[PDB]
Amino acid sequence: KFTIPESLDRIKEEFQFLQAQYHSLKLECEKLASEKTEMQRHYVMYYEMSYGLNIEMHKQTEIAKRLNTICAQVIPFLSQEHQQQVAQAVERAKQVTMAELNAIIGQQQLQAQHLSH
Amino acid sequence: KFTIPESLDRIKEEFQFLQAQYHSLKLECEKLASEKTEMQRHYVMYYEMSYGLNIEMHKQTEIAKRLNTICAQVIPFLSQEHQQQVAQAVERAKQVTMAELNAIIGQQQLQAQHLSH
Amino acid sequence: FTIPESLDRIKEEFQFLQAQYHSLKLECEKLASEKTEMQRHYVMYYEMSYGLNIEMHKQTEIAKRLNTICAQVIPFLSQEHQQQVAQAVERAKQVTMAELNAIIGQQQLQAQHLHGHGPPVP
Amino acid sequence: FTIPESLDRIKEEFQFLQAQYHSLKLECEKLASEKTEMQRHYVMYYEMSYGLNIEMHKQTEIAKRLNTICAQVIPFLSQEHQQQVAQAVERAKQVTMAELNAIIGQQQLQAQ
């Protein structure tokens, strides 16, 4: 008639179960925290990087314009035999293929490698 | 004497305490997951950004180079006063101050903000 | 079959068992007391029975002896005297239930000191 | 963080309590049987006491009467005869331990 030891052992079971589920969730949490933090460090890294890159990019863009404007302003004082040539020159100058890009990048990277001494 | 009930009720207390801890911790966990997800999003964003900005930076640098060479070649085939004029003009065109830059990036992001209504 | 109400159930059953043990305990004690009382009365009435046994067998023997003596002394008498005495003795060996109740009830009323041996049987 | 300990402790105390209840119950029941057996005996010796009392007083009375009529008959005898009968009656009312002992175990020593 006395359902005590079975009930108490049942309790031992489900307490231990709850405890286990807790600890599981806690480990999961700790992982989430770590991975989130590393993710954040990456985020900051490329944030700052994109920042500096942005600044230098705008810089070179403005320099490029200014040089072009200068060209557009020396052309009228230039002779019609020289005008056409330098016009075409500036035309193509504005065109940069992925091959050229890859070439100057690869070269200057190689330079950084060879200067890393 | 046997102090059962007194202890029995105690284990109930510790139990409800445990389940409470599980609940609150779970809420914290879900929040943390959302946060990490958002962090990852911005990581990949600033990454792709950094990439594009790198490529574009090298592009603009190359264009500026080419155009500067164009000027440095055209200028000696001009006038004496105009030769000096253009020389100084170019060597000043290379000069980009941080104030000017702040202005450029400003107007860029402001007009980006406005053109995208 | 919840978790908290489970613990409550545990308590309930335990308190129940505590109560049960208490009741059983006091019942066991009153029980033992009753036992010792019964034992006392037992020894008492056994011993009393031994006494009554001895006395009964004694008076029985004395009576038998005296009857024999009368039996032997009778044939010495006159014919009428013999009849009278024989009648007298065989009438003497007759006690009814009324007079037996009388002597018993009396000797009872005489044996008072403030014992037992009462005429009913409860 | 100290819950399984508690539970096993509860189990221990409960098992203790019920073991004690079992033992106390068994002892109680054996004691009950003993009490009842005794009661049987006390009843037995009660009714025995009753009967023994009745027969004791009956035989006592009979003895008294017979003695009285011996006393009645005696004075009508010759002197020597009177002395003999008086001595015999006198002796009769004297029962010794060996006599009554040998008498108590009569029914038993009277078989076949």
- C-beta of residue A63 within 8 angstroms of C-beta of residue B94: yes
Task: Please say whether the beta carbons of C121 and C45 come within 8 A.
Answer: no
DSSP D35-77: HHHHHHHHHHHHHHHHHHHHHHHHHHHHHHHHHHHHHHHGGGS
Distances (CA, A) of D12 to B22, D3, D16, D22: 30, 14, 6, 15
Q: Does D3 touch chain A (CB under 8 A)?
A: yes
CB count within 10 Å of CB A69 equals 12
Question: CA-CA distance, D29 to D23, in Å (whole number)?
Answer: 10
Would you state the structure tokens that stand for residue A89, as one six-digit string? 């020159």
Helix (H) / strand (E) containing B55:
helix B4-74
Task: Tell me the Cα Rg of chain B.
Answer: 33
Cα separation, B77 vs B23, in Å, equals 82
Experimental technique used?
X-ray
Exposed, middle or buried: residue A72 (CB in 10 Å: 0-12, 13-18, 19+)? exposed
Tokens of C35: 């036992």
C-alpha distances in Å from residue B39, one per residue of A43, B44, C91, D26? 7, 9, 133, 74
Q: Which residues of chain A lie closer than 8 angstroms to D19, CB-CB?
A: none
- Say how far apart CA B55 and CA A60 lie, in whole Å: 12
Alpha-carbon gap, residue D53 to D43, rounded angstroms: 15
Can you tell me the distance from the alpha carbon of A16 to that of D6, in angstroms, rounded to the nearest whole number? Answer: 13
Amino acid at D79: Q
**CA–CA separation, A18 vs A11, rounded Å?**
11
Contact call for A18 and B19, based on CB within 8 A: yes
Question: D7 with B10: CB under 8 angstroms?
Answer: no
Query: Of A64, A56, A53, A72, nearest to B94 (Cα)?
Result: A64
From B50, B56, B70, residue closest to A90, measured CB to CB: B70
For C1-41, what is the HEC assignment?
CCCHHHHHHHHHHHHHHHHHHHHHHHHHHHHHHHHHHHHHH
Q: If we measure between CA atoms, which residue out of B13, B16, D12 comes closest to residue C14? A: D12
Separation CA A39–CA B37 (nearest Å): 9
Decide: D50 and C116 in contact? Cβ < 8 Å: no
Whether the CB-CB separation of D112 and C65 falls below 8 Å is answered with: no
Cβ pair B71:A68 closer than 8 A: no
Residues 63-122 of C with CB under 8 A from D: 63, 65-67, 69-70, 73-74, 76-77, 81, 85, 88-89, 92-93, 95, 99-100, 103-104, 107, 116-119, 121-122
Q: How many residues does chain A have?
A: 117
CA dist D90 to A106, C54, C55, D76, Å? 159, 20, 18, 18
How many A-B residue pairs are in contact by the CB < 8 A criterion? 148
Cβ distance D25 to C24 under 8 Å? yes
C19 inside 8 A of chain A by CB:
no
Cβ neighbours of D63 (radius 10 Å): 23
Q: Is there a contact between B14 and D6 (Cβ–Cβ < 8 Å)?
A: no
Please check whether residue D92 is in contact with residue C69, taking contact to mean a CB–CB distance below 8 angstroms: yes
D65: chain C residues, CB-CB within 8 Å: 92-93
**Cα–Cα distance list, C73 to A89, C88, C90, D69 (Å):** 188, 13, 14, 11
**Closest-approach residue (CA) in chain C for B14:** C4
In chain A the beta strands, taken as DSSP E runs, fall at none
Q: Is the CB of A2 less than 8 angstroms away from the CB of D11?
A: no
CA distance C114 to C119: 18
Helix (H) or strand (E) holding A44: helix A5-74
Rounded to whole angstroms, the Cα distance separating C53 from D52 reads 6
| Residues sharing a CB contact under 8 Å with residue B106, sequence separation 6 or more, in sequence order | none
SS3 state at A16: helix
- What residue has token string 């490698």? A113
Q: How far is B33 from chain D (nearest CA, A)?
A: 28
Question: Which of D6, A2, C18, D13 is closest to B12 using CA atoms?
Answer: D6
- Give the chains touching B; criterion: ≥3 Cβ pairs < 8 Å: A, C, D
Half-sphere exposure of B34 (CA within 13 A, CB side): 6
Residue among B78, B94, B100 minimizing CB distance to A77 = B78
The size of chain B, in residues, is 117
CB B64 within 8 A of CB B56: no
Beta carbons within 8 Å of C45's beta carbon, 6+ residues apart: C116, D42, D45, D46, D48, D49
Contact B60, A60 (CB under 8 A): yes
Cα–Cα distance for residue pair C17/D18, rounded to 1 Å: 7
| Residue B12 with chain C: CB contacts under 8 Å | 3-4, 7
DSSP assignment letter at B76:
G
- Tracing tokens 């027969």 back to the chain, one arrives at D55
Residue with tokens 């008294």: D64
Closest CA to D93 of C66, C53, C69, C92: C66
**How far is D44 from C116, CA to CA, in rounded Å?**
14
Q: Which two tokens stand for residue D112?
A: 């076949």
* Closest-CA residue to A90 (of A68, A64, A69, A66): A68
